[PDB]
Every structure is written in structure tokens, then in C-alpha cells.
CSV table of C-alpha atoms and ligand atoms in Angstrom, one decimal:
chain,number,residue,atom,x,y,z
A,1,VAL,CA,0.0,0.0,0.0
A,2,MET,CA,1.4,3.4,-1.1
A,3,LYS,CA,1.6,5.5,1.9
A,4,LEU,CA,-0.6,8.5,2.5
A,5,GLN,CA,1.6,11.7,2.5
A,6,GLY,CA,-0.8,14.4,2.7
A,7,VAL,CA,-4.4,15.6,3.2
A,8,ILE,CA,-5.2,18.7,1.3
A,9,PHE,CA,-8.2,21.0,2.2
A,10,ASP,CA,-10.2,23.4,0.3
A,11,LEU,CA,-11.1,26.3,2.7
A,12,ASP,CA,-14.6,27.8,1.8
A,13,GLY,CA,-17.5,25.1,2.2
A,14,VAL,CA,-15.2,22.7,3.8
A,15,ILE,CA,-13.1,24.4,6.8
A,16,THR,CA,-15.5,27.3,7.2
A,17,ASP,CA,-18.4,29.2,5.3
A,18,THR,CA,-17.6,32.8,3.9
A,19,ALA,CA,-20.7,33.2,1.7
A,20,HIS,CA,-22.8,35.1,4.3
A,21,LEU,CA,-20.2,37.3,5.0
A,22,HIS,CA,-19.6,38.2,1.3
A,23,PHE,CA,-23.1,39.1,1.1
A,24,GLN,CA,-23.2,41.0,4.4
A,25,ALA,CA,-20.4,43.2,2.9
A,26,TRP,CA,-22.2,43.9,-0.2
A,27,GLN,CA,-25.1,44.7,1.7
A,28,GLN,CA,-23.6,47.2,3.8
A,29,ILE,CA,-21.9,49.0,0.8
A,30,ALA,CA,-25.1,49.2,-0.8
A,31,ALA,CA,-26.7,50.7,2.3
A,32,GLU,CA,-24.1,53.3,2.4
A,33,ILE,CA,-25.1,54.4,-0.9
A,34,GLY,CA,-29.0,54.4,-0.2
A,35,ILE,CA,-29.6,50.9,-1.8
A,36,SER,CA,-31.4,48.3,-0.1
A,37,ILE,CA,-30.6,44.6,-1.0
A,38,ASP,CA,-31.7,41.3,0.8
A,39,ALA,CA,-30.6,37.8,0.7
A,40,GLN,CA,-33.0,36.7,-2.0
A,41,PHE,CA,-31.2,39.5,-4.1
A,42,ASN,CA,-27.9,37.8,-3.3
A,43,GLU,CA,-28.9,35.0,-5.5
A,44,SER,CA,-28.2,37.5,-8.5
A,45,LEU,CA,-24.6,37.9,-7.2
A,46,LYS,CA,-24.0,34.0,-6.9
A,47,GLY,CA,-21.0,33.2,-9.2
A,48,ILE,CA,-20.6,36.9,-10.5
A,49,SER,CA,-17.4,38.9,-10.7
A,50,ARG,CA,-16.7,41.7,-8.5
A,51,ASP,CA,-17.5,44.5,-11.0
A,52,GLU,CA,-20.6,43.1,-12.2
A,53,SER,CA,-21.7,42.4,-8.8
A,54,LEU,CA,-21.5,46.0,-8.0
A,55,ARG,CA,-23.0,47.0,-11.4
A,56,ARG,CA,-26.0,44.8,-10.5
A,57,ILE,CA,-26.4,46.6,-7.1
A,58,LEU,CA,-26.2,50.0,-8.7
A,59,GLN,CA,-28.8,48.9,-11.3
A,60,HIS,CA,-31.0,47.7,-8.5
A,61,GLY,CA,-31.1,51.3,-6.8
A,62,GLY,CA,-31.1,52.9,-10.3
A,63,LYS,CA,-27.5,54.3,-9.7
A,64,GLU,CA,-25.4,53.3,-12.5
A,65,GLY,CA,-25.3,56.7,-13.8
A,66,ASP,CA,-24.0,58.0,-10.5
A,67,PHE,CA,-20.6,56.2,-10.4
A,68,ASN,CA,-17.8,56.0,-13.1
A,69,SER,CA,-15.3,53.3,-13.2
A,70,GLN,CA,-13.1,54.9,-10.7
A,71,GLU,CA,-15.7,55.7,-8.2
A,72,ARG,CA,-16.9,52.2,-8.4
A,73,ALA,CA,-13.4,51.1,-7.7
A,74,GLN,CA,-13.5,53.0,-4.4
A,75,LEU,CA,-16.8,51.2,-3.5
A,76,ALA,CA,-15.2,48.1,-4.5
A,77,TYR,CA,-12.3,48.9,-2.2
A,78,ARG,CA,-14.5,49.6,0.7
A,79,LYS,CA,-16.7,46.6,0.3
A,80,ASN,CA,-13.6,44.3,0.4
A,81,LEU,CA,-12.1,46.2,3.3
A,82,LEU,CA,-15.3,45.5,5.3
A,83,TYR,CA,-15.3,41.8,4.1
A,84,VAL,CA,-11.7,41.4,5.3
A,85,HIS,CA,-12.5,43.0,8.6
A,86,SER,CA,-15.3,40.6,9.2
A,87,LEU,CA,-13.0,37.5,8.3
A,88,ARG,CA,-10.5,38.7,11.1
A,89,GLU,CA,-13.7,38.6,13.4
A,90,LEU,CA,-14.4,34.9,12.9
A,91,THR,CA,-14.1,32.8,16.0
A,92,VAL,CA,-13.1,29.1,16.7
A,93,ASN,CA,-17.1,28.4,16.3
A,94,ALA,CA,-16.9,29.3,12.5
A,95,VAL,CA,-15.2,25.9,12.0
A,96,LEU,CA,-17.4,23.3,10.3
A,97,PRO,CA,-18.4,20.4,12.3
A,98,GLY,CA,-15.7,17.6,12.3
A,99,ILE,CA,-13.0,19.5,10.9
A,100,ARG,CA,-11.0,20.6,14.2
A,101,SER,CA,-11.3,16.9,15.3
A,102,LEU,CA,-10.1,15.3,11.9
A,103,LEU,CA,-7.1,18.0,11.8
A,104,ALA,CA,-6.2,17.0,15.5
A,105,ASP,CA,-6.2,13.1,14.4
A,106,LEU,CA,-4.3,13.7,11.1
A,107,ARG,CA,-1.6,15.5,13.1
A,108,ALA,CA,-1.5,12.8,15.8
A,109,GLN,CA,-0.9,10.2,12.8
A,110,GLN,CA,1.8,12.5,11.5
A,111,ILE,CA,0.0,13.1,8.3
A,112,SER,CA,1.0,16.3,6.5
A,113,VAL,CA,-1.7,18.9,6.1
A,114,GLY,CA,-1.8,21.2,3.0
A,115,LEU,CA,-4.4,24.2,2.0
A,116,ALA,CA,-5.4,24.5,-1.3
A,117,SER,CA,-7.6,27.8,-1.2
A,118,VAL,CA,-7.9,30.3,-3.9
A,119,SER,CA,-8.5,33.1,-1.5
A,120,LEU,CA,-6.0,35.7,-1.0
A,121,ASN,CA,-7.2,36.2,2.6
A,122,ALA,CA,-6.7,32.2,3.6
A,123,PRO,CA,-3.9,33.1,6.2
A,124,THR,CA,-6.0,35.5,8.0
A,125,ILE,CA,-8.9,33.1,8.0
A,126,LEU,CA,-6.9,30.3,9.4
A,127,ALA,CA,-5.5,32.7,12.2
A,128,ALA,CA,-9.1,33.6,13.2
A,129,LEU,CA,-10.2,30.2,13.3
A,130,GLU,CA,-7.1,29.2,15.3
A,131,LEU,CA,-6.3,26.6,12.9
A,132,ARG,CA,-3.0,27.6,11.8
A,133,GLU,CA,-1.2,25.2,13.9
A,134,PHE,CA,-2.6,22.2,11.9
A,135,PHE,CA,-1.2,23.0,8.6
A,136,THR,CA,2.2,21.9,7.2
A,137,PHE,CA,1.8,23.9,3.9
A,138,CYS,CA,-0.6,26.7,2.3
A,139,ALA,CA,-0.5,27.3,-1.3
A,140,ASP,CA,-0.1,31.0,-2.1
A,141,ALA,CA,-3.1,32.0,-3.8
A,142,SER,CA,-1.6,35.4,-5.0
A,143,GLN,CA,0.7,33.4,-7.2
A,144,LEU,CA,-2.2,31.7,-9.0
A,145,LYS,CA,-2.7,31.7,-12.8
A,146,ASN,CA,-5.6,29.6,-13.2
A,147,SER,CA,-8.3,28.9,-10.6
A,148,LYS,CA,-10.4,25.7,-10.4
A,149,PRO,CA,-11.2,23.6,-12.4
A,150,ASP,CA,-7.5,24.0,-13.4
A,151,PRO,CA,-5.6,21.8,-11.1
A,152,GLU,CA,-2.9,24.4,-10.5
A,153,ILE,CA,-3.9,25.2,-6.8
A,154,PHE,CA,-3.7,21.5,-5.8
A,155,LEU,CA,-0.6,21.0,-7.6
A,156,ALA,CA,0.9,23.9,-5.6
A,157,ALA,CA,-0.2,22.6,-2.4
A,158,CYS,CA,1.5,19.1,-3.2
A,159,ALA,CA,4.5,20.5,-4.4
A,160,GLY,CA,4.8,22.7,-1.3
A,161,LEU,CA,4.3,19.5,1.0
A,162,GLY,CA,7.1,18.0,-1.2
A,163,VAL,CA,5.3,15.0,-2.2
A,164,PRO,CA,3.6,13.7,-5.4
A,165,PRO,CA,-0.2,14.3,-6.0
A,166,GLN,CA,-1.0,10.7,-5.9
A,167,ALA,CA,0.2,10.2,-2.4
A,168,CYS,CA,-2.5,12.9,-1.4
A,169,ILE,CA,-6.3,13.1,-0.7
A,170,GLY,CA,-8.0,16.3,-1.6
A,171,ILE,CA,-11.3,17.4,-0.1
A,172,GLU,CA,-13.7,20.0,-1.9
A,173,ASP,CA,-17.4,20.9,-1.6
A,174,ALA,CA,-17.7,22.1,-5.2
A,175,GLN,CA,-17.6,20.5,-8.8
A,176,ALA,CA,-15.0,22.7,-10.0
A,177,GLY,CA,-12.9,21.6,-7.0
A,178,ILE,CA,-13.4,18.1,-7.5
A,179,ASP,CA,-12.5,18.3,-11.1
A,180,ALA,CA,-9.4,20.3,-10.2
A,181,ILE,CA,-8.4,17.4,-7.6
A,182,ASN,CA,-9.0,14.8,-10.0
A,183,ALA,CA,-7.1,16.4,-12.9
A,184,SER,CA,-4.0,17.1,-10.5
A,185,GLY,CA,-3.5,13.3,-9.8
A,186,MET,CA,-4.8,13.3,-6.1
A,187,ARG,CA,-7.5,11.1,-4.7
A,188,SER,CA,-10.9,12.9,-4.5
A,189,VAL,CA,-13.1,13.3,-1.5
A,190,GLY,CA,-16.3,15.4,-2.1
A,191,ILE,CA,-18.5,17.0,0.6
A,192,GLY,CA,-22.2,17.3,-0.6
A,193,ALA,CA,-25.0,15.7,-2.4
A,194,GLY,CA,-24.7,16.0,-6.1
A,195,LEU,CA,-21.1,16.0,-6.8
A,196,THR,CA,-19.8,13.7,-9.4
A,197,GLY,CA,-16.4,12.3,-10.0
A,198,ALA,CA,-15.4,12.0,-6.4
A,199,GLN,CA,-13.6,8.7,-5.4
A,200,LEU,CA,-15.4,9.2,-1.9
A,201,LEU,CA,-18.6,11.2,-1.8
A,202,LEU,CA,-19.6,12.3,1.7
A,203,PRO,CA,-23.0,14.2,2.7
A,204,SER,CA,-21.3,16.6,5.2
A,205,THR,CA,-18.3,17.4,6.8
A,206,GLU,CA,-19.3,15.5,9.9
A,207,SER,CA,-19.1,12.3,7.9
A,208,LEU,CA,-15.3,13.3,7.4
A,209,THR,CA,-13.3,11.2,10.0
A,210,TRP,CA,-9.7,9.9,10.0
A,211,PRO,CA,-10.8,6.1,10.5
A,212,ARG,CA,-13.1,6.7,7.4
A,213,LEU,CA,-10.2,8.6,5.4
A,214,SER,CA,-7.9,5.8,6.3
A,215,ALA,CA,-10.2,3.1,5.2
A,216,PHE,CA,-10.7,4.9,2.0
A,217,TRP,CA,-7.0,5.3,1.4
A,218,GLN,CA,-6.3,1.5,2.1
A,219,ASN,CA,-8.9,0.5,-0.2
A,220,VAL,CA,-7.8,2.7,-3.3
A,221,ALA,CA,-4.2,2.6,-2.8
A,222,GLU,CA,-3.8,-1.2,-2.8
A,223,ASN,CA,-2.2,-2.9,-5.8
A,224,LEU,CA,-1.7,-6.7,-6.1
A,225,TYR,CA,1.0,-5.9,-8.4
A,226,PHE,CA,3.2,-4.1,-5.9
A,227,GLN,CA,2.8,-7.1,-3.3
B,1,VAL,CA,7.3,4.0,-12.4
B,2,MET,CA,4.0,1.9,-12.0
B,3,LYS,CA,3.4,-0.2,-14.9
B,4,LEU,CA,0.5,0.6,-17.4
B,5,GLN,CA,-1.4,-2.4,-17.5
B,6,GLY,CA,-4.6,-1.4,-19.5
B,7,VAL,CA,-6.1,1.2,-21.8
B,8,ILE,CA,-9.8,1.3,-21.5
B,9,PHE,CA,-12.0,3.0,-24.1
B,10,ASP,CA,-15.5,4.3,-24.3
B,11,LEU,CA,-17.1,3.5,-27.5
B,12,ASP,CA,-19.5,6.5,-28.6
B,13,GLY,CA,-17.6,9.5,-29.4
B,14,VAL,CA,-14.3,7.9,-29.0
B,15,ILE,CA,-14.2,4.6,-31.3
B,16,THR,CA,-17.0,5.5,-33.6
B,17,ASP,CA,-20.1,8.0,-33.6
B,18,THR,CA,-23.8,6.5,-33.3
B,19,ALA,CA,-25.7,9.8,-32.9
B,20,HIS,CA,-26.6,10.1,-36.5
B,21,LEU,CA,-27.8,6.5,-36.5
B,22,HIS,CA,-29.9,6.9,-33.6
B,23,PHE,CA,-31.6,10.0,-35.4
B,24,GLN,CA,-32.0,8.3,-38.7
B,25,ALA,CA,-33.9,5.1,-36.9
B,26,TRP,CA,-36.1,7.8,-35.0
B,27,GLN,CA,-36.6,9.5,-38.3
B,28,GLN,CA,-37.6,6.3,-40.2
B,29,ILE,CA,-40.1,5.2,-37.5
B,30,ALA,CA,-41.7,8.7,-37.5
B,31,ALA,CA,-41.9,8.5,-41.3
B,32,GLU,CA,-43.6,5.1,-41.1
B,33,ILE,CA,-46.3,6.8,-39.0
B,34,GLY,CA,-46.9,9.8,-41.3
B,35,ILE,CA,-44.7,12.1,-39.3
B,36,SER,CA,-41.8,14.2,-40.5
B,37,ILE,CA,-38.9,15.3,-38.3
B,38,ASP,CA,-35.4,16.7,-39.2
B,39,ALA,CA,-32.0,17.0,-37.6
B,40,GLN,CA,-33.2,20.3,-36.3
B,41,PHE,CA,-35.9,18.5,-34.4
B,42,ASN,CA,-33.3,15.9,-33.2
B,43,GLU,CA,-32.0,18.6,-30.6
B,44,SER,CA,-35.3,17.7,-28.8
B,45,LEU,CA,-34.4,14.2,-28.5
B,46,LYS,CA,-30.7,14.7,-27.3
B,47,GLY,CA,-30.5,13.4,-23.8
B,48,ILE,CA,-33.8,12.0,-23.6
B,49,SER,CA,-35.3,8.6,-22.5
B,50,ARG,CA,-36.5,6.2,-25.3
B,51,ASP,CA,-40.3,6.7,-24.1
B,52,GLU,CA,-40.1,10.4,-24.0
B,53,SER,CA,-38.3,10.5,-27.4
B,54,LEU,CA,-41.1,8.6,-29.0
B,55,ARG,CA,-43.7,10.6,-27.1
B,56,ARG,CA,-42.0,13.9,-28.4
B,57,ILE,CA,-42.2,12.5,-31.9
B,58,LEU,CA,-45.9,11.7,-31.4
B,59,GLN,CA,-46.6,15.1,-30.0
B,60,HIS,CA,-45.0,16.7,-33.1
B,61,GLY,CA,-47.3,15.1,-35.4
B,62,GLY,CA,-50.4,15.5,-33.3
B,63,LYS,CA,-50.6,11.6,-32.7
B,64,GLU,CA,-50.3,11.1,-29.0
B,65,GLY,CA,-53.9,9.8,-28.9
B,66,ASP,CA,-53.3,7.4,-31.6
B,67,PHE,CA,-51.2,4.9,-29.6
B,68,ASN,CA,-51.4,3.4,-26.2
B,69,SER,CA,-48.4,2.1,-24.0
B,70,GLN,CA,-48.4,-1.1,-25.8
B,71,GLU,CA,-48.6,0.2,-29.2
B,72,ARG,CA,-45.7,2.5,-28.4
B,73,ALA,CA,-43.8,-0.2,-27.2
B,74,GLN,CA,-44.0,-1.8,-30.7
B,75,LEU,CA,-42.9,1.2,-32.4
B,76,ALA,CA,-40.0,1.4,-30.1
B,77,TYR,CA,-39.2,-2.1,-30.9
B,78,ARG,CA,-39.2,-1.4,-34.5
B,79,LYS,CA,-37.3,1.6,-34.0
B,80,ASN,CA,-34.6,-0.3,-32.1
B,81,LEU,CA,-34.6,-3.1,-34.7
B,82,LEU,CA,-33.9,-0.7,-37.5
B,83,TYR,CA,-31.2,1.1,-35.3
B,84,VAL,CA,-29.3,-2.4,-34.6
B,85,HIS,CA,-29.5,-3.2,-38.4
B,86,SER,CA,-27.8,0.1,-39.3
B,87,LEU,CA,-25.1,-0.7,-36.5
B,88,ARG,CA,-24.4,-4.1,-38.2
B,89,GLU,CA,-23.9,-2.0,-41.4
B,90,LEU,CA,-21.1,0.1,-40.1
B,91,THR,CA,-17.8,-0.3,-42.1
B,92,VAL,CA,-14.1,0.1,-41.0
B,93,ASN,CA,-14.4,3.6,-42.4
B,94,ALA,CA,-16.6,4.5,-39.2
B,95,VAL,CA,-13.8,4.1,-36.9
B,96,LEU,CA,-12.7,7.8,-35.8
B,97,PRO,CA,-9.4,9.1,-36.9
B,98,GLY,CA,-6.3,7.8,-35.1
B,99,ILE,CA,-8.2,5.1,-33.2
B,100,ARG,CA,-7.1,2.0,-35.4
B,101,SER,CA,-3.3,3.0,-35.3
B,102,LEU,CA,-3.5,3.7,-31.7
B,103,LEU,CA,-4.9,0.2,-31.0
B,104,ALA,CA,-2.4,-1.4,-33.3
B,105,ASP,CA,0.4,0.3,-31.4
B,106,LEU,CA,-1.0,-0.6,-27.9
B,107,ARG,CA,-1.1,-4.4,-29.0
B,108,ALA,CA,2.5,-4.1,-30.4
B,109,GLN,CA,3.5,-2.8,-26.9
B,110,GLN,CA,1.5,-5.7,-25.2
B,111,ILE,CA,-0.7,-3.4,-23.4
B,112,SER,CA,-4.2,-5.0,-22.8
B,113,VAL,CA,-7.1,-3.2,-24.1
B,114,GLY,CA,-10.4,-2.8,-22.4
B,115,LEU,CA,-14.0,-1.6,-23.4
B,116,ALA,CA,-16.0,0.5,-21.0
B,117,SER,CA,-19.4,1.0,-23.1
B,118,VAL,CA,-22.8,1.1,-21.8
B,119,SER,CA,-24.2,0.0,-24.9
B,120,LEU,CA,-25.7,-3.4,-25.2
B,121,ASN,CA,-24.8,-3.3,-29.0
B,122,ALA,CA,-21.0,-3.0,-28.2
B,123,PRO,CA,-19.8,-6.4,-29.5
B,124,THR,CA,-22.0,-5.9,-32.8
B,125,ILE,CA,-20.6,-2.6,-33.1
B,126,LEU,CA,-16.7,-3.7,-32.7
B,127,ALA,CA,-17.4,-6.6,-35.2
B,128,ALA,CA,-18.7,-4.3,-37.9
B,129,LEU,CA,-15.7,-2.0,-37.2
B,130,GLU,CA,-13.5,-5.1,-37.6
B,131,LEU,CA,-11.9,-4.0,-34.2
B,132,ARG,CA,-12.6,-7.1,-32.0
B,133,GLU,CA,-9.1,-8.5,-32.3
B,134,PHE,CA,-7.7,-5.5,-30.7
B,135,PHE,CA,-9.6,-6.0,-27.3
B,136,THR,CA,-8.6,-8.0,-24.6
B,137,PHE,CA,-11.7,-7.5,-22.5
B,138,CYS,CA,-15.1,-5.7,-23.0
B,139,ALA,CA,-17.4,-4.9,-19.9
B,140,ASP,CA,-21.0,-6.4,-20.1
B,141,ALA,CA,-23.5,-3.6,-20.3
B,142,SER,CA,-26.3,-5.9,-19.8
B,143,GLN,CA,-25.0,-6.4,-16.1
B,144,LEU,CA,-24.8,-2.6,-15.3
B,145,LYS,CA,-26.9,-1.3,-12.5
B,146,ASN,CA,-25.8,2.3,-12.7
B,147,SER,CA,-24.5,4.3,-15.6
B,148,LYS,CA,-22.1,7.2,-16.1
B,149,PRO,CA,-21.0,9.3,-14.0
B,150,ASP,CA,-21.2,6.2,-11.6
B,151,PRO,CA,-17.7,4.4,-12.0
B,152,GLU,CA,-19.3,0.8,-12.3
B,153,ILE,CA,-18.6,0.3,-16.1
B,154,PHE,CA,-15.0,1.4,-15.7
B,155,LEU,CA,-14.6,-0.8,-12.6
B,156,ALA,CA,-16.0,-3.7,-14.4
B,157,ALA,CA,-13.7,-3.2,-17.3
B,158,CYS,CA,-10.6,-3.3,-14.9
B,159,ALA,CA,-11.8,-6.2,-13.1
B,160,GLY,CA,-12.1,-8.0,-16.5
B,161,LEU,CA,-8.6,-7.2,-17.4
B,162,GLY,CA,-7.5,-8.5,-14.1
B,163,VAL,CA,-5.8,-5.2,-12.7
B,164,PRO,CA,-6.4,-2.4,-10.4
B,165,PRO,CA,-8.0,0.8,-11.8
B,166,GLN,CA,-4.8,2.9,-10.9
B,167,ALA,CA,-2.9,0.9,-13.5
B,168,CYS,CA,-5.2,1.7,-16.3
B,169,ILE,CA,-5.7,4.9,-18.7
B,170,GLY,CA,-9.5,5.5,-19.4
B,171,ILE,CA,-10.6,7.6,-22.5
B,172,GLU,CA,-13.8,9.5,-22.8
B,173,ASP,CA,-15.5,12.2,-24.8
B,174,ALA,CA,-18.3,13.1,-22.4
B,175,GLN,CA,-18.1,14.7,-18.9
B,176,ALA,CA,-20.1,12.0,-16.9
B,177,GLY,CA,-17.6,9.8,-18.5
B,178,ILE,CA,-14.7,11.7,-17.4
B,179,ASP,CA,-16.3,11.6,-13.8
B,180,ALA,CA,-16.8,7.9,-14.0
B,181,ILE,CA,-13.1,7.3,-15.0
B,182,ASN,CA,-11.9,9.7,-12.1
B,183,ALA,CA,-14.3,8.2,-9.6
B,184,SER,CA,-13.0,4.6,-10.5
B,185,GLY,CA,-9.5,5.6,-9.7
B,186,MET,CA,-8.3,5.4,-13.1
B,187,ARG,CA,-6.2,7.7,-15.0
B,188,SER,CA,-8.3,10.0,-17.1
B,189,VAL,CA,-7.9,11.3,-20.7
B,190,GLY,CA,-10.6,13.5,-22.4
B,191,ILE,CA,-11.4,14.0,-25.9
B,192,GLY,CA,-13.0,17.3,-26.7
B,193,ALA,CA,-12.7,20.8,-25.7
B,194,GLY,CA,-14.8,21.9,-22.4
B,195,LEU,CA,-14.3,18.7,-20.7
B,196,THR,CA,-13.1,19.3,-17.0
B,197,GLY,CA,-11.3,17.1,-14.5
B,198,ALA,CA,-9.3,15.2,-17.0
B,199,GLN,CA,-5.6,14.5,-16.3
B,200,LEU,CA,-5.0,14.8,-20.1
B,201,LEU,CA,-7.1,16.9,-22.2
B,202,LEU,CA,-6.9,16.5,-26.0
B,203,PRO,CA,-9.0,18.3,-28.9
B,204,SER,CA,-9.8,15.1,-30.9
B,205,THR,CA,-9.1,11.5,-31.3
B,206,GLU,CA,-6.3,12.3,-33.9
B,207,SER,CA,-4.3,13.6,-30.8
B,208,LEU,CA,-4.5,10.2,-29.3
B,209,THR,CA,-1.3,8.5,-30.2
B,210,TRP,CA,0.9,5.8,-28.1
B,211,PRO,CA,3.9,8.2,-27.8
B,212,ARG,CA,1.6,10.8,-26.2
B,213,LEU,CA,-0.2,8.4,-23.9
B,214,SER,CA,3.2,6.7,-23.0
B,215,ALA,CA,4.5,10.1,-22.2
B,216,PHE,CA,1.5,11.1,-20.2
B,217,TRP,CA,1.8,7.8,-18.2
B,218,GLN,CA,5.5,8.3,-17.4
B,219,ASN,CA,4.5,11.8,-16.1
B,220,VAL,CA,1.6,10.9,-13.9
B,221,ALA,CA,3.0,7.5,-12.6
B,222,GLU,CA,6.3,8.5,-11.1
B,223,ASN,CA,6.7,8.8,-7.5
B,224,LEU,CA,10.1,9.9,-6.0
B,225,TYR,CA,9.1,7.9,-2.9
B,226,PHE,CA,9.1,4.6,-4.9
B,227,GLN,CA,12.6,5.0,-6.2
C,1,CL,CL1,-11.2,28.9,-0.4
C,2,CL,CL1,-20.7,22.8,-7.4
C,3,CL,CL1,-20.7,3.8,-25.5
C,4,CL,CL1,-20.3,16.3,-21.9
C,5,MG,MG1,-15.2,25.3,-1.3
C,6,MG,MG1,-10.0,36.0,17.3
C,7,MG,MG1,-18.8,8.7,-25.6
C,8,MG,MG1,-19.3,-5.5,-42.5
C,9,MG,MG1,-7.7,10.2,-10.1
């Protein structure tokens, strides 16, 4: 059996959820220019670029004509600033169920732990969650050329851990993330119903335990022709 | 470097294209009940169940009321019969470019070749294309419980070849197929722009050569920690 050398984690939707904080920042910037948006409006911002998100908010309040590209840039700066402050305010209680105990178990088993997050705010987030001590290496999102589903960020995490991708498990909650893990050569674990292409599919982070990951590893890593 | 033990092929969209033949069979059965459909109508049959495909044809001609479920079953039987006859009429020229030369090369290299097709007509098809002699094992689609993206059909092909999935390359043209290959533990090769999650993505079957597959294998199978 090939030895498991690393377990590499996506951040959003696996370690913690940042979606509500993104919306709350947009809602605050909107309110500061006299526009009311709600969680129902936030569906219109789901999977949308930063510039188009702001434009949709402006359209919603009939205010596209009141801001040029430079002034919109200033609104976007403030929105991001408020968002990052909210990340620094996260507590240990924002970690998803099962995650802290799994990280503790991996470290007790001397398994190296990687982070493959595309967020430039990842270190700020892990610090707030009080989880930095569990990670061996975190990929640098500021150096990323292609986001998921390109395997780059996962390949970067593996290289940082100093091991080949096939000696690692990757954990994701999104299809583009599963696709990126698969394309990199890593063994894929998905969190959430509906994901396809995962070698191990779990319904939530609570199902994510060391004994389960270890059993999964022993199953997929075995090769009669290496006995 | 782990030894490459098998290359496993999807049938439709990789070895040959059956889409036009499916449409031509539907068009003939439609004509036999006085209904004219064209290739433009065939978009409405794309990714549709057999029963709903027939119902849409009947609706198109205003004839839903003229056939009960048993009579529709008789129309479906004839459509399938015409379709299967057309498969038996396929010639060597229906094989996609690059495929026959690749199969010849794999066999010269003593690499076992598998088929992972969900079609019950696969053996009829390979016989017509004069390709049976290149295949070591073909998975039995009549025993299949879950179709792609479930990895079952690829796992069945690997088991039939007597080797673990990770010692095999799988080749697919569809996203559900790539997902199935990935979930099985096999190394994935995709044919067609737009596919995600493939370890090697090629634009067409013409790009699919032994030297390329071999270079791909040597790259992904290497592990410093096995030297
Ligand atoms: Cl992330
Ligand atoms: Cl998703
Ligand atoms: Cl097929
Ligand atoms: Cl597809
Ligand atoms: Mg995520
Ligand atoms: Mg704090
Ligand atoms: Mg296909
Ligand atoms: Mg013939
Ligand atoms: Mg894989």
C-alpha cells in the first residue's frame, strides 16, 4: 500500500463558510449608498465577478449613472475592506463540524496537512479560526494563474508539501474543485450531495473522520502488482 | 514507475459516432407513422429517454392519442430493430481518426485493451468496425446497475482485465464519462474541448497517439518515494 503523505483541504465550504460574510459586506456597501438589498437579491450575485456584482447592485437602486469606473473602484475597495475585517472577526465556532477533530487526528498520525484555497485571505482566516497550527503548507493564492477547475492550486499544495499528488487526498465541496483535484492526480473526496467524479462522496463534513479517510486510502491505494 | 497495464475505451464519441444512426432510426419510424422530423428536431431528442423521445415525436405530429403504451412499445421495438441493423452495416471507415493505429500500437506494446461501453450493442459494433481483435476484455453492459457518471462500468472493465484501476488509462468524450473514470481510480484522458477534470485533455481522437499516452503515463505514474 502506497503511503498516504498528505491531506489537502479546500477552505470555503469545507473548513468554514464565507458566503454569508460576502453578502453582508455587499449589503453594507449598498446601504451606504442608499440601496437596500436582501438575501433574496444575493442569488443575483452568486457566481458573479466583483465588478458585475457592484453593477447589479447599482442597477437595483437605479444608480449606475452616479458612479464612473474609478468611483466604483472606490466602492469595491471599501466593500473588500469591510469583508476582510469580518474575516478577522471569525471565531473558533465558525469551523465546520468535524473539521477540528479531523485535523487533530491527522496530526496525531503524523500526516502532513495542506491548504489549497484560492482566497488571498486564507492565512487571515486560518488565524481567526485558530487552525494555523494544523497546517504544514498553504498554497499561495497570490501566485495563482488559473483557478479551479484547473489543477494548479492543488498541484501547488502538493509541491509545497514535497510529495507527488497521487500520495495525497484532496477534499472539496464544489464540482470545479473536485475536477481540479482529479486533474491533478490526487485522490478525491467530495462533501455534498450532487457532486460527481469523487472517489469518496460524503454528505457533510461531519462524515469526514480519520478512520473513514484511512479506510478509503487503504482501499484505493492497494495494488496486487506491488505486493 | 508503476507499470501501465490497460487502456480502456469508451465507445460512442471515441471509437465511432452512433448519434446520426440513432436519429436516422427515429426519423424512419416517424416517417412510417406519417410524421416528418429533421435534424433540427433531433435536438429535442438529445439526452432524452426512449419513451419520452417517442412521445415527443408523436406530439410533433399530433398523434399521441393514436397510440397506447403497448402500441408505443411496438413502435419502439421497430425503431430499435432498425437502429441495430444500421450498426451491423457500419464499415471500417466509421472508426474515428487515429483509433485503429493507436489500437495497433497498444497491441504491439503488449498493453491490454478494455472496452467500457454502456451499449448493449457494443460487440455488434466492434465486429462491424473490424476491431474485436484489438480488445482483451469488454465490460458487459447488460449487467450494469448504474450508468455514468457512476464508476461501475469502468470498474467492471478493470476487473475483467484483472488489474487495479490505477494501473489503467481511461478515454472518454463526455463529462459524465470523465467523472466515472475519475471516481473509479483510473487515470483520465478526455477528448474534446470543454471537458473538465481530465488529467490529459486532447482536442480530438487524432491527438490520441501511443507516444503521447506513454509520455502522459510516465509523467503521472512517477513517485520519488518509490525509487
Ligand atoms: Cl477557498
Ligand atoms: Cl458545485
Ligand atoms: Cl458507448
Ligand atoms: Cl459532456
Ligand atoms: Mg469550497
Ligand atoms: Mg479572534
Ligand atoms: Mg462517449
Ligand atoms: Mg461488414
Ligand atoms: Mg484520479
